[PDB]
Amino acid sequence: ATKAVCVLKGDGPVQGIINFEQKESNGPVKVWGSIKGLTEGLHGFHVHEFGDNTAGCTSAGPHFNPLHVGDLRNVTADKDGVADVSIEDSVISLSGDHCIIGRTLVVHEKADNAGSRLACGVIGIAQ
Amino acid sequence: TKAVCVLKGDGPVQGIINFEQKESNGPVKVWGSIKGLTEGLHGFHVHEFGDNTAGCTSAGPHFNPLSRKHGGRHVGDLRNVTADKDGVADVSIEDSVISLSGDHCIIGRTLVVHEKADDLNAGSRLACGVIGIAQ
Ligand SMILES: [Zn+2]
Numbered sequence: 331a332t333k334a335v336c337v338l339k340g341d342g343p344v345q346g347i348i349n350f351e352q353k354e355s356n357g358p359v360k361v362w363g364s365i366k367g368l369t370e371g372l373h374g375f376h377v378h379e380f381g382d383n384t385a386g387c388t389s390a391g392p393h394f395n396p397l398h399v400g401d402l403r404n405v406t407a408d409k410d411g412v413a414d415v416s417i418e419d420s421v422i423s424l425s426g427d428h429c430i431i432g433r434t435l436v437v438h439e440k441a442d443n444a445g446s447r448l449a450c451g452v453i454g455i456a457q
Numbered sequence: 458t459k460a461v462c463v464l465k466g467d468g469p470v471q472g473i474i475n476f477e478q479k480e481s482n483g484p485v486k487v488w489g490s491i492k493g494l495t496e497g498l499h500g501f502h503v504h505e506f507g508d509n510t511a512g513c514t515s516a517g518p519h520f521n522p523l524s525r526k527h528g529g530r531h532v533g534d535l536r537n538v539t540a541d542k543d544g545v546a547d548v549s550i551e552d553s554v555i556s557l558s559g560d561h562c563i564i565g566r567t568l569v570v571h572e573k574a575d576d577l578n579a580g581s582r583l584a585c586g587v588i589g590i591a592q
């Protein structure tokens with residue numbers, strides 16, 4: 331794949347669509363989109379190990395870190411609860427050892443200690 | 458290698474489907490159950506894209522990397538599941554065309570259950586989910 335997409339949903343109002351693009355194998359991944367339904371301020375934004383939604387976000391497993399790879403840091407919601415995301419990450423990848431396709435993207439209650447998982451979805455092939 | 462998929466859709470249809478493949482060149486065991494179905498046959502397919510932005514509508518066509526006609530074939534052609542009188546379909550498939558690695562890899566794609574029988578014309582897409590890596 332050169333493109334992936336993730337629909338974030340949870341038990342509460344947090345919802346979003348996040349795109350990923352890696353035009354070059356092993357190159358930087360562009361991450362962008364928007365998440366709404368969040369409290370104003372910082373929220374942890376992570377790839378978790380398993381694309382297992384059988385128990386909602388609770389089944390996502392730990393931070394993806396094949397023996398921190400999944401730590402995309404934080405998104406910031408505005409006064410309307412909307413987080414616009416536009417990131418370049420050179421650690422995640424859409425192939426190889428750091429492949430995140432089929433894993434889970436999670437937005438957290440607090441800045442990353444990041445607290446509850448508000449919304450998540452499985453990262454799917456988009457192109 | 459193990460994978461899982463939670464099927465959701467606009468009505469009562471829902472299910473959990475598991476995947477396991479012991480060797481890269483071996484068959485994939487597919488098992489789980491789907492509820493909320495009409496009694497009888499339902500098309501059961503992997504579709505190309507793990508894009509659920511428009512629910513099942515955005516999943517693209519049957520997964521077909523080798524550009525074959527439909528059977529049960531496209532890589533993603535898993536034929537039909539059968540729902541009982543209570544609308545419950547048990548899934549227990551071994552398939553040697555799908556894989557969890559290589560070019561027939563279905564991780565990150567979409568599993569879809571259909572309104573009607575796949576004639577091996579499956580009709581509308583009732584429920585779907587993105588296939589994810591599992592523990
Ligand atoms: Zn996390």
Ligand SMILES: [Zn+2]
Pocket residue numbers: 500501502504519569571579
């Ligand atoms: Zn189909």
Ligand SMILES: [Zn+2]
Pocket residue numbers: 502519526527528530531533534
């Ligand atoms: Zn087909």
